[model samples]
Target: VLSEGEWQLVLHVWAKVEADVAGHGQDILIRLFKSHPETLEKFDRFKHLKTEAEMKASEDLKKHGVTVLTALGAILKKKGHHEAELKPLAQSHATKHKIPIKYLEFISEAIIHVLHSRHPGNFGADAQGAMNKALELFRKDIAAKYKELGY
Candidate 1:
């Protein structure tokens, strides 16, 4: 499980992303909270994260972490933020069990699984659009984060 501090860092990461990616990250975060309402607490203060100076001070670390999450959808196998439950179990499994390399080909396998297994209808077009946006925002946020955070 991620520690509370880790969770807070994730939110700070989210805030930086939403600010830079034209609110794309915010929608993903909304979807995340819709799936897991408890996460609302995690983002309550997200609107006002850091003063400019503080952000400048910790910029590098923020950038690195954002890059991690941008490419992490492949690492974690999630579509947008709307796919499956990203509980602590998911994070824990990746850290504990060692996710494979081939599976990380930016495959849409996780998206396919989420669409077919978790939903009621077809994911033909709508899901694709959402996923595309997710990817777009992810890349931007990840890059910006790379500028800000370290590993």
Candidate 2:
């Protein structure tokens, strides 16, 4: 759990990069898929792209990046109190897409990974600890749903 001060810190840090959703969002996704190429296979929309450039250029990537970041943005806006809004995302990933729950874990890692690397000062150790815990709570929420129906 995050305190009001830490929640404000999360919002402040996110504000620094929220302006460039395409750039920041795509960059995060790029790092994620590039680091783990097999993760691409989970999305039929992106599975066909055999190369990094192709994946980068694919409009689907841009769209999905916006969607994914938007959800996180919404969560940050709530200061980690958006479980009602986030629950369906977990269920969808589990039942609808059948994406491995591990991929959910990857999303959390990649989010923190990019935050630390891209915004070093804003996402320093203290902020990292807060974001790490917040995202982990979110990941666990999703993981619980994933295991519920054997996703």
Candidate 3:
């Protein structure tokens, strides 16, 4: 689906998106993983992966995820600043399925794999759209989970 050259092309775009976005890392992963959700159980924030690709993808996805999640943390922190509040947002993670953090990582890796699978230059347009779609689903899932928790 891609030449190594194509990988470089997407990386450059990824870099641009990295710069343009407010929550590049998390926004992209939350979005991308929503699209290819199978990745979650496979991510290893510490160690382990399905392939060299999976490992690389995990790191890449986590890099993005951390960026977005941290932003959320910071933003929410300010709202509750007087008390040093950090909700951990842990409840949003609950589900009828309990989608493990490892699995979310796997989905992130898959997203990168798919992006790399595309041809050069042509991918940039659709890639952002793809990210948006994933973010929408991930957030929706989290919101739903939050509701279940009475939040």
* Best-matching candidate per lDDT: 2
lDDT of 3 by residue, 51-142 (tens): 44563456566565666545543432232231222233435344434555445455445445444454345556655454434434444444
Off by over 4 Å in 1: 1-109
Of candidate 2, the 10-residue stretch with the lowest lDDT total is 120-129
In model 3, the worst 10-residue window by lDDT is 77-86
> Candidate 3's C-alpha lDDT?
0.46
Best by TM-score: 2
Task: Assess the local accuracy of residue 118 in candidate 2 as a C-alpha lDDT between 0 and 100.
Answer: 77
The residue-by-residue lDDT of candidate 1 on 35-88, one tens digit each, is 444433333333233333443344443453354345453422333342233333
Give each model's whole-structure lDDT: 0.38, 0.77, 0.46
lDDT of 2 at 125: 73
* Candidates in descending lDDT order: 2, 3, 1
Q: What tens digits encode model 2's per-residue C-alpha lDDT throughout 101-131?
A: 6776787788777777777766767777777
- Candidate 1 C-alpha error for residue 96, in Å: 15
